[PDB]
Design an enzyme around this catalytic site. Sequence first.
Site: not given
Ligand SMILES: CC#CCn1c(N2CCC[C@@H](N)C2)nc2c1c(=O)nc1n2CCCN1Cc1nc(C)c2ccccc2n1
Lengths: 728, 728
Positions: A509, A592-593, A670, A702
């Site tokens: 992440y 994502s990030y 997305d 997304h």
């Molecule tokens: C582009 C970008 C970005 C930053 N970003 C943000 N912020 C704050 C909330 C509003 C938002 N626009 C930006 N929350 C994020 C992320 C991120 O990149 N990854 C995550 N989270 C929170 C949930 C967990 N994860 C990690 C994650 N995300 C997904 C979608 C996964 C899917 C499968 C397995 C593991 C995963 N882990």
Amino acid sequence: TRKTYTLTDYLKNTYRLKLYSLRWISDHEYLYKQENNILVFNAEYGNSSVFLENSTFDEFGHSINDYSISPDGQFILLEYNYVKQWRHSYTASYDIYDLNKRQLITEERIPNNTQWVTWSPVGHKLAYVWNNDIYVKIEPNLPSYRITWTGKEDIIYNGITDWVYEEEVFSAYSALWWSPNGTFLAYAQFNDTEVPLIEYSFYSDESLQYPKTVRVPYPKAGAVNPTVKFFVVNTDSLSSVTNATSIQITAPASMLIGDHYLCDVTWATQERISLQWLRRIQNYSVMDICDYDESSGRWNCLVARQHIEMSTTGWVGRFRPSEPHFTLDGNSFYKIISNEEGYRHICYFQIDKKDCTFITKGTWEVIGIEALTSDYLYYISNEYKGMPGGRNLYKIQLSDYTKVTCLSCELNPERCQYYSVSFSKEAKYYQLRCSGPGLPLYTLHSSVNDKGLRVLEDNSALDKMLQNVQMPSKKLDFIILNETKFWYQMILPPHFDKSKKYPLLLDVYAGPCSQKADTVFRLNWATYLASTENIIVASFDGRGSGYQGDKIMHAINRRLGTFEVEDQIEAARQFSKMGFVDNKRIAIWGWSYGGYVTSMVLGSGSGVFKCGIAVAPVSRWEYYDSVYTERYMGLPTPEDNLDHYRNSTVMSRAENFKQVEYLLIHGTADDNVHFQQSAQISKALVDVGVDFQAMWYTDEDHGIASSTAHQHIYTHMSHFIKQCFSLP
Amino acid sequence: TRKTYTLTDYLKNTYRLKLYSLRWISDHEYLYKQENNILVFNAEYGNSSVFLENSTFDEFGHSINDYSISPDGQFILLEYNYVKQWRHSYTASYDIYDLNKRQLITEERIPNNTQWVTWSPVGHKLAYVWNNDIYVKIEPNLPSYRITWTGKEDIIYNGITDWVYEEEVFSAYSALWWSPNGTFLAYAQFNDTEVPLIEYSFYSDESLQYPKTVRVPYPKAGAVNPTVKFFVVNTDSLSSVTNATSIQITAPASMLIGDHYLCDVTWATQERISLQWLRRIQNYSVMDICDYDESSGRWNCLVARQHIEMSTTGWVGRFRPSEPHFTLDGNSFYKIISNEEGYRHICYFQIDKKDCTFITKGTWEVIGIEALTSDYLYYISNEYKGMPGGRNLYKIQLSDYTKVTCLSCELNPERCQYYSVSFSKEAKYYQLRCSGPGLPLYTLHSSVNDKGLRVLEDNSALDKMLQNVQMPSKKLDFIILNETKFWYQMILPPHFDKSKKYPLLLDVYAGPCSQKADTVFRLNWATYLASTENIIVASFDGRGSGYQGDKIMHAINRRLGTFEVEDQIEAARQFSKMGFVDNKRIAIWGWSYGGYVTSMVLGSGSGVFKCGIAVAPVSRWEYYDSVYTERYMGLPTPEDNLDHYRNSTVMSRAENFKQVEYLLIHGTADDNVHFQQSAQISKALVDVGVDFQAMWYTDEDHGIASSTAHQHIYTHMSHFIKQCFSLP
Ligand SMILES: CC#CCn1c(N2CCC[C@@H](N)C2)nc2c1c(=O)nc1n2CCCN1Cc1nc(C)c2ccccc2n1
Ligand SMILES: CC#CCn1c(N2CCC[C@@H](N)C2)nc2c1c(=O)nc1n2CCCN1Cc1nc(C)c2ccccc2n1
Ligand SMILES: *[C@@H]1O[C@H](CO)[C@@H](O[C@@H]2O[C@H](CO)[C@@H](O)[C@H](O)[C@H]2NC(C)=O)[C@H](O)[C@H]1NC(C)=O
Ligand SMILES: *[C@@H]1O[C@H](CO)[C@@H](O[C@@H]2O[C@H](CO)[C@@H](O)[C@H](O)[C@H]2NC(C)=O)[C@H](O)[C@H]1NC(C)=O
Ligand SMILES: *[C@@H]1O[C@H](CO)[C@@H](O[C@@H]2O[C@H](CO)[C@@H](O)[C@H](O)[C@H]2NC(C)=O)[C@H](O)[C@H]1NC(C)=O
Ligand SMILES: *[C@@H]1O[C@H](CO)[C@@H](O[C@@H]2O[C@H](CO)[C@@H](O)[C@H](O)[C@H]2NC(C)=O)[C@H](O)[C@H]1NC(C)=O
Ligand SMILES: *[C@@H]1O[C@H](CO)[C@@H](O[C@@H]2O[C@H](CO)[C@@H](O)[C@H](O)[C@H]2NC(C)=O)[C@H](O)[C@H]1NC(C)=O
Ligand SMILES: *[C@@H]1O[C@H](CO)[C@@H](O[C@@H]2O[C@H](CO)[C@@H](O)[C@H](O)[C@H]2NC(C)=O)[C@H](O)[C@H]1NC(C)=O
Ligand SMILES: *[C@@H]1O[C@H](CO)[C@@H](O[C@@H]2O[C@H](CO)[C@@H](O)[C@H](O)[C@H]2NC(C)=O)[C@H](O)[C@H]1NC(C)=O
Ligand SMILES: *[C@@H]1O[C@H](CO)[C@@H](O)[C@H](O)[C@H]1NC(C)=O
Ligand SMILES: *[C@@H]1O[C@H](CO)[C@@H](O)[C@H](O)[C@H]1NC(C)=O
Ligand SMILES: *[C@@H]1O[C@H](CO)[C@@H](O)[C@H](O)[C@H]1NC(C)=O
Ligand SMILES: *[C@@H]1O[C@H](CO)[C@@H](O)[C@H](O)[C@H]1NC(C)=O
Ligand SMILES: *[C@@H]1O[C@H](CO)[C@@H](O)[C@H](O)[C@H]1NC(C)=O
Ligand code: NA
């Protein structure tokens, strides 16, 4: 021989975590949905009664998506025809059922395509948004009073957020805030007139001859942002003859000088509201405290009651300035702020004094304030055993700050190191929710003497099922980089043998305030990879990660795609030197990030990684939304941070992908990380003659979360990792 | 050991075919470019002079894309700032250079963003299209006369075609036709007001923050089509009247009853024009022959001079009704039409008699009429040795049809079996262009005696280079199915041994009137697959294929995705029956219609093919354009052919893809076969849980023709085929 946790187990949810989702309705009772029936429980004794029989709506004629019982328990709001919009937004149809006269209300129904609906916090008034305008119903069977008349699709939003405020500011579609007893209704109005539109194709069912073009007002970094206004309406003085008067509360002069945001709304008393405003350069915020003036019907925000929150090292708050927690009289409040050592702690403020007093301190952080009484403040922190990835509930005696009691630390130390909590109305009871390292455990407690009343759900059924499965283990530890400890976790295969070399997948992440090394129990893709495929799945929290103070968090200020990328490479380099890791088989992946960091790592030329997968990655900061991007990057102008926006792209690293196997995946619909971002990565790779693997998901957003696309993506990624690691 | 023809040889164009592109400027001279110099050649003697030195435009300040010399040789039109649009269309800047004064014209310049420009056929008048309106310049340095004022972007097209007419009707952007001596300018006007738009994202350079949405009026099957009008203006009246009238020639009543197309415009004399109109149900066409009436200033089309062309078994023409070739006096004409046996032959018509006389006959077809003199008609046909895949030039005596000479058949029968021809202005000389089976050979000949003057280009440099390469061979033969001969070709690996079992790749087009079995010499991807990878690359012309009569060509009438698909499956079975094919390693691939057939074959459940690749395929006929689709399918309505449109989609066969390895590829900016087509295939595969390989090409169109994308696609496909065939 016992089975392993398979890809089909993950995709078909064979092993289910049981929950205990309750809804407090008073200081002593809660609602709980059991076998489609809604029960009411007495917290003191644990006895229940049926509140609403599952059969009540057998002849409804529509599948009910959700229900919302009015605070007085007299009415139930029935949600149906649910149509998802963005992460939080959706439209639905609503019917109200009278629980006393046992009948559906057929008069003055809430319209179809309603955008948001909420009961008042006391009684049974309703406020709803339809066609971007606010309406109020004093009684469910009575005609609505129209509050706003300016609502215009994609332009004027009253009482609902636009795309960027929904996603990045409020984490909600609602932009309505009832006063504590329901007298006033405060609301924001967003104006997206000059905000540019993101446009993308939507293909729909095969029957659609011409694809549709979806158009969403979405400000990319440095673009024109929505503007905002804030209002308060008295719902006790509404007329059927006259239009409602909304009183505007203007932002302070320090905000009006330039672009700004409304970032928090918190009612203090029946006649006092607090607002926080944030500058577009997100290192300066101001709280106004506004009182109702009975003689003039106006809301006045005294300059002596303003509170400035600023940062010289980074932005304000973790993702935004924190919420205040006001005392019963509203004359003072508690708020988490970064202390002089860069650690987030609870500060106690007087409404008319500039200096606040810190009530907690130390090299750990308060996660959130959970409840407040005249004698105690209850909060969650990662203080326990100095583990930033653990969470426990504590209470602090307000008359003596040296008296801090941990309420969850010793309940079950081996099973439970990560808690969240839900308190009853006046904090007489609390439900603790343990989410790891063991199976989730839900318990009920009374605040008077912190008695552990009863076990609500202990997941003993899942524990029995998992006894017959070769489950992976989780190791949580740390490495030292430049005198600082940085934590990591490894999902280890069953019967782990330190004398054997395992392939390793780095799950990333690594965004600002991220935390991927924690004590949470998860059943996910990594569980299958470790259990069935014998892959170690590692995660690391390096520079820019959260909950460890600003020296670490703000390390990436104005510099995304630098230290957090280098730190993932350094962690893998260190793991590659461990005797149980096969250095010829190290992979990396993220969404994502995490997809951006995976791509930046794969293009770094480090030579550490054999392969990797990016899902819906950011590729260039100018393509991402203003609120999130600018918080860390500032503005993409020559006078501000344009050079770094330009140096931090994945596309500039394309030539370095020649030595890696890369799989790039993105949903075509997305609305968040636009398909454009991956379309630019692929074009840059083609331009330098680098071969790679790709997969688009038609009409997925997304989440790539439809049942069939979820199964397809994990199936495709599993084949890719197995091929990379020479696994049959 | 000699090297093989590698993938890098194909991609880097190491072994180059030399061409001899001349431009006839009179009955005895041609222009030819040698070392960037334009030389003028005397055809009779072979001697040359420098027409325009390569240094002339060194100080021009722009790279010159192309040039056009006026017919009188007084001026040169210089094309620069070339910006490609669709298959034929583009915009450009133009400057005119006075050849006598040896000076560039600086006044009354052709505007920037000009859509089309053409000299008159005699002298030096110019007609050009700018902002969808027609302009005429009598003299290069003098002001233009505006002809139309109705031009409107994406709505009204004067003198240029809309998308569908460019691609499917005229195979040209131009919709203007000068009369033989340049007195009149005829033109068509297209009205796309109610034509729906295809919309897709265009990402552009990475600097573009928001993707652009490209919107093109494009009628999909059964949608609202453009309407058309035809006009003729007297250009000699321009300098005498303020606003010269454009006289409309209306379509006949038999066409005005319903939707129709203008399909051919051919001038007969200085005062006689022929027009062919086609009904939207493309089995009925009408030719009108219109004369200028000097007294009324109108154009009249006598019903006694109207010619009907219809088909009871299919559509009219190969892709459209054929063009007429008028005798000098304009009182009679020759035209290729389907005879009573279904073979396309030359028919001779008197303008005012309805019954024509066939001048050729036989179980073979005339391909095209090339030249017509007062004594002879010259045509290309596949008569020689009954080989439908061969092409030769013939000369027929107009005073005695029994006197037919083959001009090219015996020139070099082993090396040359596929010819095209370029005649000088009044057919005094002709250049023959042999394209196979041996290396291309370009020769010059005198019409007075049919003698060979000289060899212009024999590709001896390439022949010398290929001697050191292990080149594949080509087999052209036939199989007998249901007493009908069906032709095939195989690209055979060097040292082909019939006692060995080779992997086979079936290279498919198979659209109506397609021909994939021929005598042309090619250096392409198949050359590499056979030479380096030892794969046999086979192609088969089954039911629906062209140049063999209507019984074969019309076999798929109203039934696309049926017999032509079945015949490709049968061909692979027949190739296995030959004994030199490894039945466990049969693949299939195709682009465009070939991509649709490949996908239909892979979804058939035949078990014959291990894998396949579809590039930019059609997936559902309702997604493709009206003109092409409806020609073979009729309309997608319950009363017409909807059931078959719904029964012939790739998506309906998704479940059968579980039996094969599929690679799906498509350019995101494909204006022709929309990315939508593959987006619907991928979604159907995801929906049934079929794993497959995919690749999108950002901003590439139907050709995936940019230097980098062309190299990337063939590299990606080569890895896929090699993996399928277990080749290291
Ligand atoms: C582009 C970008 C970005 C930053 N970003 C943000 N912020 C704050 C909330 C509003 C938002 N626009 C930006 N929350 C994020 C992320 C991120 O990149 N990854 C995550 N989270 C929170 C949930 C967990 N994860 C990690 C994650 N995300 C997904 C979608 C996964 C899917 C499968 C397995 C593991 C995963 N882990
Ligand atoms: C959808 C569809 C269709 C039918 N279609 C047509 N007609 C008549 C011209 C106007 C047009 N809209 C429809 N010409 C076509 C095809 C086709 O599918 N394939 C081909 N040709 C002509 C050239 C050779 N090939 C085969 C081939 N082989 C390769 C390798 C290609 C590569 C890039 C683009 C096209 C290619 N085509
Ligand atoms: C919500 O939508 C439904 C269905 O469109 C409306 O209910 C009636 O439903 C039938 C068809 O199902 C229509 O013939 C009527 O026009 C509808 N109108 C009435 C007044 O009964 C329903 O009215 C909508 N609800 C609201 C609050 O507008
Ligand atoms: C909720 O709070 C509001 C505001 O304090 C109360 O409204 C006031 O009530 C008193 C009556 O005791 C009046 O003197 C004021 O003029 C009212 N203020 C306004 C702004 O209307 C209200 O009664 C409370 N409602 C409930 C149900 O407790
Ligand atoms: C908010 O952050 C901005 C950007 O870092 C700080 O801006 C100052 O102004 C420019 C940057 O646009 C530079 O010339 C200065 O060096 C910046 N000051 C720094 C980096 O300390 C602004 O000072 C910040 N506000 C607060 C309250 O710290
Ligand atoms: C090809 O050669 C012929 C004959 O040498 C050239 O034709 C002209 O021949 C006359 C003979 O009296 C000479 O006076 C001229 O030099 C020629 N005229 C012109 C206008 O060039 C002919 O020019 C040659 N053609 C080319 C294209 O070089
Ligand atoms: C192009 O075709 C459109 C119709 O598809 C014509 O537009 C109509 O014009 C008439 C005036 O004669 C109006 O009364 C109608 O309202 C128009 N209809 C639509 C749908 O726009 C248009 O005039 C044609 N243009 C030319 C130059 O022939
Ligand atoms: C040249 O003649 C054409 C044909 O009469 C004129 O076109 C008309 O222009 C007027 C408005 O200016 C419209 O009301 C008509 O519908 C047009 N008809 C057509 C067929 O285009 C044109 O404007 C004239 N140009 C000049 C300079 O007078
Ligand atoms: C090209 O052909 C046109 C049309 O035949 C010729 O113009 C006609 O010429 C005759 C004299 O031969 C006159 O009777 C007519 O008035 C002309 N008609 C029109 C419509 O202009 C024209 O002269 C020929 N041009 C050249 C350069 O030979
Ligand atoms: C629980 O038990 C008490 C009596 O011991 C009774 O007052 C109450 O109604 C019960 N509550 C519920 C929610 O059933
Ligand atoms: C929305 O903002 C625009 C300026 O971007 C202004 O013209 C317009 O009046 C605003 N509308 C409302 C209802 O505030
Ligand atoms: C309320 O405001 C709206 C919108 O400006 C107007 O159309 C309506 O007439 C008003 N009603 C009254 C009662 O003033
Ligand atoms: C074309 O564009 C250039 C640059 O904008 C300009 O200098 C030139 O005058 C233009 N030519 C014409 C014919 O308008
Ligand atoms: C044209 O085709 C349609 C559909 O097949 C048919 O109904 C009509 O009779 C045809 N015309 C001829 C001349 O066969
Ligand atoms: Na207990």
